Enzyme design. Structure first.
Site, mmCIF file in Angstrom:
data_model
loop_
_atom_site.group_PDB
_atom_site.id
_atom_site.type_symbol
_atom_site.label_atom_id
_atom_site.label_comp_id
_atom_site.label_asym_id
_atom_site.label_seq_id
_atom_site.Cartn_x
_atom_site.Cartn_y
_atom_site.Cartn_z
ATOM 1 N N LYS A 1 13.001 87.235 68.697
ATOM 2 C CA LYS A 1 12.337 88.537 68.909
ATOM 3 C C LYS A 1 11.332 88.378 70.062
ATOM 4 O O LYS A 1 11.266 89.257 70.976
ATOM 5 C CB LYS A 1 11.614 88.989 67.687
ATOM 6 C CG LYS A 1 11.058 90.380 67.865
ATOM 7 C CD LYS A 1 10.517 90.824 66.499
ATOM 8 C CE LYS A 1 9.401 91.830 66.640
ATOM 9 N NZ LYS A 1 9.681 93.074 65.889
ATOM 10 N N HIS B 1 9.631 90.063 75.336
ATOM 11 C CA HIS B 1 8.666 89.550 76.278
ATOM 12 C C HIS B 1 9.161 88.810 77.514
ATOM 13 O O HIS B 1 8.315 88.606 78.392
ATOM 14 C CB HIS B 1 7.538 88.770 75.667
ATOM 15 C CG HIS B 1 6.782 89.605 74.610
ATOM 16 N ND1 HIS B 1 5.989 90.672 74.941
ATOM 17 C CD2 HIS B 1 6.748 89.465 73.252
ATOM 18 C CE1 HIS B 1 5.485 91.141 73.788
ATOM 19 N NE2 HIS B 1 5.915 90.423 72.722
ATOM 20 N N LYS C 1 7.240 102.031 71.252
ATOM 21 C CA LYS C 1 6.257 100.960 71.244
ATOM 22 C C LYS C 1 5.299 101.284 72.378
ATOM 23 O O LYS C 1 5.603 101.499 73.535
ATOM 24 C CB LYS C 1 6.914 99.568 71.390
ATOM 25 C CG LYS C 1 6.045 98.381 70.960
ATOM 26 C CD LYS C 1 6.588 97.025 71.378
ATOM 27 C CE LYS C 1 5.490 95.962 71.269
ATOM 28 N NZ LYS C 1 6.086 94.602 71.468
ATOM 29 N N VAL D 1 2.442 99.638 73.924
ATOM 30 C CA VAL D 1 2.107 98.570 74.893
ATOM 31 C C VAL D 1 3.075 97.395 74.704
ATOM 32 O O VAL D 1 3.313 96.981 73.549
ATOM 33 C CB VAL D 1 0.668 98.040 74.700
ATOM 34 C CG1 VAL D 1 0.429 97.173 75.956
ATOM 35 C CG2 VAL D 1 -0.368 99.192 74.774
ATOM 36 N N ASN D 2 3.542 96.874 75.807
ATOM 37 C CA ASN D 2 4.390 95.681 75.697
ATOM 38 C C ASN D 2 4.297 95.003 77.076
ATOM 39 O O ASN D 2 4.412 95.668 78.098
ATOM 40 C CB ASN D 2 5.760 96.160 75.436
ATOM 41 C CG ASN D 2 6.647 94.912 75.230
ATOM 42 O OD1 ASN D 2 7.523 94.499 76.101
ATOM 43 N ND2 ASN D 2 6.544 94.277 74.122
ATOM 44 N N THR D 3 4.104 93.683 77.080
ATOM 45 C CA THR D 3 4.023 92.866 78.305
ATOM 46 C C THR D 3 5.311 92.050 78.449
ATOM 47 O O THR D 3 5.769 91.388 77.562
ATOM 48 C CB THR D 3 2.821 92.013 78.350
ATOM 49 O OG1 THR D 3 1.624 92.709 78.104
ATOM 50 C CG2 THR D 3 2.655 91.289 79.659
ATOM 51 N N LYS E 1 -6.795 87.425 68.935
ATOM 52 C CA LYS E 1 -7.671 88.624 68.949
ATOM 53 C C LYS E 1 -8.023 88.875 67.460
ATOM 54 O O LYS E 1 -9.232 89.204 67.291
ATOM 55 C CB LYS E 1 -7.039 89.891 69.540
ATOM 56 N N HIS F 1 4.503 85.683 69.258
ATOM 57 C CA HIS F 1 3.676 86.923 69.414
ATOM 58 C C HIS F 1 2.990 86.721 70.762
ATOM 59 O O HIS F 1 2.474 85.706 71.122
ATOM 60 C CB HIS F 1 2.759 86.989 68.146
ATOM 61 C CG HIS F 1 1.580 87.874 68.417
ATOM 62 N ND1 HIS F 1 1.611 89.257 68.531
ATOM 63 C CD2 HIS F 1 0.281 87.462 68.644
ATOM 64 C CE1 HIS F 1 0.325 89.698 68.811
ATOM 65 N NE2 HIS F 1 -0.493 88.589 68.886
ATOM 66 N N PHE F 2 2.968 87.792 71.526
ATOM 67 C CA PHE F 2 2.177 88.078 72.726
ATOM 68 C C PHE F 2 0.823 88.662 72.370
ATOM 69 O O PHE F 2 0.792 89.801 71.842
ATOM 70 C CB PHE F 2 2.948 88.932 73.746
ATOM 71 C CG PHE F 2 2.287 88.796 75.098
ATOM 72 C CD1 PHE F 2 1.131 89.590 75.368
ATOM 73 C CD2 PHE F 2 2.761 87.902 76.050
ATOM 74 C CE1 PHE F 2 0.465 89.462 76.597
ATOM 75 C CE2 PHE F 2 2.072 87.820 77.272
ATOM 76 C CZ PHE F 2 0.951 88.547 77.564
ATOM 77 N N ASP F 3 -0.295 87.982 72.613
ATOM 78 C CA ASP F 3 -1.613 88.328 72.137
ATOM 79 C C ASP F 3 -2.315 89.137 73.228
ATOM 80 O O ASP F 3 -2.881 90.180 72.897
ATOM 81 C CB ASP F 3 -2.473 87.187 71.636
ATOM 82 C CG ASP F 3 -3.556 87.639 70.603
ATOM 83 O OD1 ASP F 3 -3.077 88.311 69.632
ATOM 84 O OD2 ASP F 3 -4.697 87.263 70.855
HETATM 85 N N1 LIG Z 1 1.064 93.157 70.403
HETATM 86 C C1 LIG Z 1 0.973 93.182 71.731
HETATM 87 N N2 LIG Z 1 -0.231 93.461 72.226
HETATM 88 C C2 LIG Z 1 -0.219 93.504 73.575
HETATM 89 C C3 LIG Z 1 0.831 93.268 74.416
HETATM 90 N N3 LIG Z 1 0.422 93.357 75.691
HETATM 91 C C4 LIG Z 1 -0.841 93.615 75.678
HETATM 92 N N4 LIG Z 1 -1.293 93.739 74.366
HETATM 93 C C5 LIG Z 1 -2.698 93.964 73.961
HETATM 94 C C6 LIG Z 1 -3.726 93.209 74.733
HETATM 95 C C7 LIG Z 1 -4.913 94.144 74.744
HETATM 96 O O1 LIG Z 1 -5.644 93.617 73.635
HETATM 97 C C8 LIG Z 1 -4.408 95.519 74.345
HETATM 98 C C9 LIG Z 1 -4.598 96.791 75.049
HETATM 99 O O2 LIG Z 1 -5.633 97.581 75.556
HETATM 100 P P1 LIG Z 1 -6.678 97.215 76.724
HETATM 101 O O3 LIG Z 1 -7.949 97.172 75.840
HETATM 102 O O4 LIG Z 1 -6.843 98.653 77.454
HETATM 103 O O5 LIG Z 1 -5.911 96.399 77.779
HETATM 104 O O6 LIG Z 1 -3.059 95.301 73.870
HETATM 105 C C10 LIG Z 1 2.075 92.989 73.867
HETATM 106 O O7 LIG Z 1 3.074 92.764 74.515
HETATM 107 N N5 LIG Z 1 2.096 92.963 72.443
#
Ligand SMILES: Nc1nc2c(ncn2[C@H]2C[C@H](O)[C@@H](COP(=O)(O)O)O2)c(=O)[nH]1
Length: 124
Positions: A7, A12, A41, A43-45, A66, A119-121
């Protein structure tokens, strides 16, 4: 079912590109990776590095997650990443994203044998 490690690769990893090439990146990649299938979803990096360089993070700087967990690791090196975040025009099933390309350190949580990212943090 899919593994936590598989996953993370589906959500990612984008080793096939060096950087997002157009403002469309997130819209095409969120849909094709199945990230928009039950809901948008939000936010996703994407990480544009070899899988071996990102699994290596699990042996790098140990940091708190976090949420307080202490199985997080921060990359020593910056990485090429794409942050995809939903836009105000986003409405399920037509999820829509803004694409932002950056060079940031990544923070992942790791688990298992072999010990890999699950997990991506955060990017920092
Ligand atoms: N679970 C998850 N959190 C992510 C991902 N990419 C970024 N985030 C998180 C990191 C930041 O804590 C947050 C977003 O809001 P900001 O405070 O504006 O950048 O979301 C991802 O791919 N998965």
């Amino acid at each position: 079912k899919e593994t936590a490690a598989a996953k993370f690769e589906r959500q990612h990893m984008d080793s096939s590109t060096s950087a997002a090439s157009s403002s469309n990146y997130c819209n095409q990649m969120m849909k094709s990776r199945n990230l928009t299938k039950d809901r948008c979803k939000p936010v996703n990096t994407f990480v544009h590095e070899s899988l071996a360089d990102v699994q290596a993070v699990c042996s790098q700087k140990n940091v708190a997650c976090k949420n307080g967990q202490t199985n997080c690791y921060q990359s020593y090196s910056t990485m090429s990443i794409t942050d995809c975040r939903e836009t105000g025009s986003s409405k399920y099933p037509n999820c829509a994203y803004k694409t932002t390309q950056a060079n940031k350190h990544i923070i992942v949580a790791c688990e298992g044998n072999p010990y890999v990212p699950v997990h991506f943090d955060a990017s920092v």
